């Protein structure tokens, strides 16, 4: 049917990246865009329940 909304800010792509140092660098680049929600980013990973 239709798809959430959140599910793209989510970026289930990089949440479901390896802790390795290598996905870690590309990332990193996201915080360019995730300055306060640096930490709300976390909780998303750790839980994505809705």
């Given at each position: 049917?239709?798809?959430?909304?959140?599910?793209?800010?989510?970026?289930?792509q990089t949440?479901?990246?390896?802790?390795?140092?290598?996905?870690?660098?590309?990332?990193?680049?996201?915080?360019?865009?995730?300055?306060?929600?640096?930490?709300?980013?976390?909780?998303?990973?750790?839980?994505?329940?809705?």
């Open positions: 049917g239709s798809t959430p909304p959140q599910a793209l800010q989510q970026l289930l949440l479901k990246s390896p802790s390795s140092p290598q996905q870690q660098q590309q990332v990193l680049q996201i915080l360019k865009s995730n300055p306060q929600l640096m930490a709300a980013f976390i909780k998303q990973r750790s839980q994505h329940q809705q």
